[PDB]
Design a binder for these strands. Structure first.
Length: 272
RNA sequence: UUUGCGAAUUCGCUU
RNA sequence: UUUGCGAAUUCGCUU
């Protein structure tokens, strides 16, 4: 075995998105507000690189890379776990083509092994889980399960499922609230008429959503017939209101998912 | 939101 | 010759 190096990818929102730049009128999500973050596990030390900005949805995030631990060993089983999770991040979360990126969390900041094992256990790790509700086993809504979630529609896009940040819980709406489109009276009807979906819960609030994808390179700030059609499609996509009962919750929390989309930027800076 | 997914028509590039 | 390379316009898909 060889001794290990563990680095924290420390993230702080040093300049939040000004009102004039917040075109999609989002909430701002400072990375520092949640303890669980990312890190890098290497065989050899990383040369001390200065702080650098990535430009995210919430504004300007300062990226630092501090040493957490060195000189320690890890078992074969632990590295195999860390590695598989490394590959999951880039292939399933970020959907793409330094030795190991891995999740850290406090108990002080350390390798979050239990988090990784939970992800392996989960059934919404790759696609859409089979969940069966009836009148006697109806869907139950827990507000806190949607406080920091990434949800995926169970009822479409099976080939490659869409993942959305939960952007708002509308506690004033229910599957019986009026439907935005006129061809349907309610949400319940829409999903029944169009998708043949029955709901066991009719008290559940509905979900406002935001798409999870973004450009690879975030090192610079954001500031035509097919490009136009996409702008409208992406706008309709973001104004979608979802029924919780119809969505699986992804095992990767939303606050971590936000940080994961910064990774290719950071890895690229560290190499070139 | 990066070349979102999928159809149709028009046009340029070779010797 | 497999979705050849690159432009333009029209249209469908989400709630």
């Amino acid at each position: 075995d060889q001794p290990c190096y563990l680095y924290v990818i420390g993230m702080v929102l040093t300049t939040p998105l000004p009102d004039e730049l917040n075109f999609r009128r989002r909430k701002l999500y400072p990375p520092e507000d949640t303890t669980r973050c990312f890190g890098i596990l290497t065989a050899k030390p990383i040369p001390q690189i200065p702080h650098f900005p990535v430009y995210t949805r919430s504004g300007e995030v300062t990226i630092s890379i501090e040493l957490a631990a060195s000189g320690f060993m890890l078992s074969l089983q632990m590295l195999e776990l860390i590695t598989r999770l490394h590959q999951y991040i880039f292939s399933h979360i970020l959907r793409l083509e330094a030795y190991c990126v891995l999740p850290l969390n406090v108990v002080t900041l350390d390798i979050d092994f239990k988090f990784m094992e939970d992800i392996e256990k989960s059934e919404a790790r790759i696609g859409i889980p089979s969940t069966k509700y009836t009148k006697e086993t109806p869907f139950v809504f827990k507000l806190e399960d949607y406080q920091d979630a990434v949800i995926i529609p169970r009822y479409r896009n099976f080939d490659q499922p869409h993942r959305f940040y939960v952007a708002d819980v509308y506690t004033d709406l229910t599957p019986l609230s009026k439907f935005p489109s006129p061809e349907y009276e309610t949400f319940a009807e829409y999903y029944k008429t169009k998708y043949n979906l029955d709901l066991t819960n009719l008290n559940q609030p509905l979900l406002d959503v935001d798409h999870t994808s973004s450009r690879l390179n975030l090192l610079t700030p954001r500031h035509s017939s097919a490009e136009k059609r996409k702008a409208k499609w992406e706008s309709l996509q973001n104004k979608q209101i979802l029924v919780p009962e119809l969505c699986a919750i992804h095992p990767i929390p939303a606050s971590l998912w936000r940080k994961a989309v910064c990774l290719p930027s950071i890895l690229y800076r560290l190499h070139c």
